[PDB]
Symmetry: C2
Subunit: 370 residues, 2 copies
């Protein structure tokens, strides 16, 4: 079992070797002053002695205290007008409004041809190798067969094949968790937050929640915030998948009823086939979530994946897989079995040191409080 | 119409990116001679002279070196006399080897001294780096070339341009060779009165005291052989097999050894029937296959090595695309264009373009003055 679902693949038929990615290309509101008669719909700039500026839109036509020659007095009158609803604040949202007006209003046909906002680019990839050995005793192999009719080395080989596939999935996750930007940061901070960590015991992070029930839902809400930031930065859309620790997955599986599948048929039949190398399911109808079997502490990462082979932000491009390796160790001539694979990986360039903490397709958050 | 890379490895691409291989090589207390030492024939002693450090001296004569010479100056004097007499002979690295083998051989053991083939053998990744040209021509000529000469116009321009792009890529290869080539007439290939990297025909040292051009030209060849040797030594693959050189240098080389180059006498007799000057001139001394750098910028030659294996060149070019056409016109004046694009990728034996500049052991470049 593999999990190369949340990466592009673009498989290789030669190392070195390349992948492609659809990389994106990447106004003086008049000052408000004493005596100013604001005009409804107009916007003024006002710097408060404490906290600095906001842009204030008039809803009410009003003269802002002509006697307010003292900035402290002017701030007081303005605050009164704000309280009265006469003056309303927005910051960048108004900067956008004025920019649009100025450019449209005084615009011209000229030749403002813009490129579509996409660079579209590629990287070179080596089909980096990975390999494991079985390293096993003769007596064991003799006994597995002699004692229960087992296939001995064949089974050890199957375990080993599973392990190498797991390591590759683990590698992909490690790179995601390397390159992902740290989430619950910047655009995704709650003002009272701890920047990068979601603490299920912290009243800000849990939005005033009570017990695990509501605290758990609050995490999913942070996940949506991460998905939004991803969408914005990549220019491609909301995060489509989540990679998370077992603690987190169990938390997320406590919500969205049966979405994270327990493989309940498995439990019912007493562990008939555990297949623990797959995605649990889709949270919110939005995020396919995968379990990081090797999570080191406790965390989750939200990421985006489009339909295009070139729209993942991370690529895995297999060249060689499960090539059997066999022989013996002459020191005692004990059996050797093993598997080799070669694939190569890559990322949206985002300019590995240009991906470290920079990969716009992903946002990583540390988890505390479960 | 020729690649002029018949002296290099190709390993052509089936996709850009794209790769090449190269057969990169992997890369004793002589007892001090002292006053009273009774030497024994064939034995080797270490001696530090007051002047110019040390020498290693082998006895040819079983002689005591002045037991009263407690003064290093006296010891040196006796030694010099014994050397003049032929009793003591100086060799340096040539001795280090004999002591090492005697000691190591005699005291060796079956153990596990399995030595490696002296080769690393490795690969490089190459993008199908592109180059391109346009005809940049006018319609009024196309109209009259047809009306006046009965010429196919664009067709000839296409042939010219195709020729130019091929010549330009061949030029690029030569530039990379020269870029990466080590400086010749340097280190192992210098004489005491030498100038480090340049052969000057007006310099008595470079021409080894030659009488007129005949001997001077041969002196250039002698420097070429020395370069071929240093290449052989450093690559571990053998003497340089070819030469790339400027028009002046080639004409000089072709002035000795009678028939190294083709004079293209058929061509000349027929009054330039088809010059095709994109081909190797011939073989210098029967040893080095030599090509003319028709674009040489200073005046020079480069000696280089190439084995039969494409992985044994020191430089690689993997043609992916060649002569892909361009066609259109520029509305600013509506004048037409025709053109070509190529894609290929190049490589250099790793030698660890950062590890290529002035480091490529397969090649040695020497500038030539005074021709």
């Amino acid at each position: 079992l593999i999990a190369f679902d949340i990466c592009g693949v673009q498989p290789m038929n030669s190392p070195t070797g390349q992948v492609f990615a659809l990389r994106a290309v990447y106004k003086k509101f008049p000052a408000l002053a004493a005596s100013t008669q604001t005009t409804v719909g107009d916007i003024y700039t006002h710097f408060f002695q404490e906290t600095g500026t906001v842009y204030l839109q008039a809803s009410v036509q009003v003269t802002i205290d002509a006697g307010a020659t003292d900035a402290a007095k002017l701030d007081a009158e303005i605050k009164k007008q704000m309280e009265a609803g006469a003056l309303v604040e927005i910051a960048e949202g108004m900067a956008t409004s004025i920019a649009e007006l100025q450019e449209g209003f005084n615009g011209s046909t000229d030749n403002p041809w813009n490129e579509m906002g996409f660079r579209i680019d590629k990287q070179v990839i080596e089909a980096k190798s990975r390999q494991l050995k079985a390293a096993y005793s003769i007596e064991l192999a003799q006994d597995l067969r002699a004692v229960h009719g087992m296939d001995a080395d064949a089974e050890l080989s199957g375990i080993l094949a599973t392990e190498i596939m797991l390591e590759i999935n683990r590698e992909v996750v490690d790179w995601i968790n390397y390159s992902a930007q740290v989430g619950k940061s910047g655009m995704t901070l709650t003002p009272g937050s701890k920047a990068g960590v979601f603490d299920f015991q912290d009243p800000i992070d849990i939005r005033g929640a009570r017990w695990a029930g509501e605290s758990f839902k609050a995490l999913l809400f942070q996940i949506d915030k991460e998905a939004v930031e991803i969408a914005r930065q990549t220019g491609r859309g909301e995060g489509n998948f989540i990679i998370a620790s077992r603690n987190v997955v169990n938390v997320l599986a406590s919500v969205d009823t049966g979405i994270s599948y327990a493989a309940q048929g498995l439990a019912t039949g007493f562990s008939t086939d555990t297949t623990k190398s797959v995605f649990a399911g889709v949270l919110g109808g939005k995020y396919r979530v995968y379990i990081d079997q090797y999570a080191k502490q406790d965390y989750f990462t939200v990421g985006y994946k489009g339909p295009n082979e070139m729209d993942a932000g991370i690529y895995y491009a297999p060249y060689v897989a499960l090539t059997p390796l066999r022989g013996s160790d002459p020191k005692n001539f004990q059996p050797v079995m093993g598997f080799k694979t070669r694939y190569g990986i890559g990322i949206n360039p985002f300019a590995i040191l240009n991906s470290l903490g920079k990969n716009a397709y992903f946002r990583r958050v540390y988890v505390k409080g479960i």
